[PDB]
Amino acid sequence: GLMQFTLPVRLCKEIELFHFDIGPFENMWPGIFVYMVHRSCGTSCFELEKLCRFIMSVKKNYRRVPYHNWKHAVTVAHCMYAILQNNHTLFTDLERKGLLIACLCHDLDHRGFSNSYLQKFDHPLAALYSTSTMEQHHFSQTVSILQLEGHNIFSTLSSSEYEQVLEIIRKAIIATDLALYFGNRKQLEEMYQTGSLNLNNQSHRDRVIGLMMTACDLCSVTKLWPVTKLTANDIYAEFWAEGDEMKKLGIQPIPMMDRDKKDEVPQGQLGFYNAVAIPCYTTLTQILPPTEPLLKACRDNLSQWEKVIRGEE
Ligand SMILES: Cn1cc(-c2ccccc2)nc1COc1nc(N2CCOCC2)c2cnn(C)c2n1
Ligand SMILES: [Mg+2]
Ligand SMILES: [Zn+2]
């Protein structure tokens, strides 16, 4: 009970900031996560032994892929920690519990391929889950790990609290399907501007948590430029492998997945910032003003991609 995780001074300070990078020492990531649960949620939220066993089983079920890996999981959980810590009173006890777990689990057993590639390949998961294919799988894997002996970190919740937390996690994980973000953000945009947004309306909170999930998932664009740019290499390493696999099925991939079109990456990042990232962080900042640093970091990175196109780097 009296057993805190404590980080070295630079991490203790920087972990609080939106732009924190969890570093290249994989063995410190579990401790960074527990640290974040303890401060976000409490030292009482989870039995440490169960939580540690849960974390290590989650890690084992992430694959050695360039981007959708264990580092991504922990990175996405840290962005959520930063949102929760900057919005202390807006979220329920259960939400703080569910959302860090949801972020840690949101890409469980990812293979580095899009929903589209699974459908074109005719992967068995595409028959089991006709939309949000990988995301229904990520939630399935989360429930599987929760049911391993000694891994039920939620065991102390009442039956209805348990049903609620697993429903928060399910919705949060499904919301990371970017195909769903566009309409979620539009509805939030309309609701905020017509002034109908109501955080006591469960369907509204669901929407706001979905947008938080998109914001955490895309958070490479909110890092300092050298982190953003080096993370982009990992993202493209997967896209280009998928593109290669599309060419093996006899399908020209979209340019973003064609390694022969590497030259077009900077212009493609611009469209991404303008169509996805900037809108995401703008609506998030309208709803949750203290998340503004994410939008400011995203705008700085957009300006850095503009500099790449102008050959200024
Ligand atoms: C939209 N677009 C078009 C082009 C392009 C490139 C070369 C030639 C021509 C076009 N490049 C993009 C960038 O796509 C993209 N998708 C992301 N998603 C999240 C994780 O997986 C799926 C989706 C993320 C996440 N973080 N970042 C930076 C991302 N960038
Ligand atoms: Mg995903
Ligand atoms: Zn993700």
UniProtKB/Swiss-Prot annotation:
<feature type="binding site">
    <location>
        <position position="68"/>
    </location>
    <ligand>
        <name>3',5'-cyclic AMP</name>
    </ligand>
</feature>
<feature type="binding site">
    <location>
        <position position="269"/>
    </location>
    <ligand>
        <name>3',5'-cyclic AMP</name>
    </ligand>
</feature>
<feature type="binding site">
    <location>
        <position position="107"/>
    </location>
    <ligand>
        <name>a divalent metal cation 1</name>
    </ligand>
</feature>
<feature type="binding site">
    <location>
        <position position="107"/>
    </location>
    <ligand>
        <name>a divalent metal cation 2</name>
    </ligand>
</feature>
<protein>
    <recommendedName>
        <fullName>cAMP and cAMP-inhibited cGMP 3',5'-cyclic phosphodiesterase 10A</fullName>
    </recommendedName>
</protein>
<feature type="domain" description="PDEase">
    <location>
        <begin position="1"/>
        <end position="312"/>
    </location>
</feature>
<feature type="binding site">
    <location>
        <position position="68"/>
    </location>
    <ligand>
        <name>3',5'-cyclic GMP</name>
    </ligand>
</feature>
<comment type="similarity">
    <text>Belongs to the cyclic nucleotide phosphodiesterase family.</text>
</comment>
<feature type="binding site">
    <location>
        <position position="269"/>
    </location>
    <ligand>
        <name>3',5'-cyclic GMP</name>
    </ligand>
</feature>
<feature type="binding site">
    <location>
        <position position="72"/>
    </location>
    <ligand>
        <name>a divalent metal cation 1</name>
    </ligand>
</feature>
<feature type="binding site">
    <location>
        <position position="106"/>
    </location>
    <ligand>
        <name>a divalent metal cation 1</name>
    </ligand>
</feature>
<comment type="subunit">
    <text>Homodimer.</text>
</comment>
<feature type="binding site">
    <location>
        <position position="217"/>
    </location>
    <ligand>
        <name>a divalent metal cation 1</name>
    </ligand>
</feature>
<comment type="function">
    <text>Plays a role in signal transduction by regulating the intracellular concentration of cyclic nucleotides. Can hydrolyze both cAMP and cGMP, but has higher affinity for cAMP and is more efficient with cAMP as substrate. May play a critical role in regulating cAMP and cGMP levels in the striatum, a region of the brain that contributes to the control of movement and cognition.</text>
</comment>
<feature type="active site" description="Proton donor">
    <location>
        <position position="68"/>
    </location>
</feature>
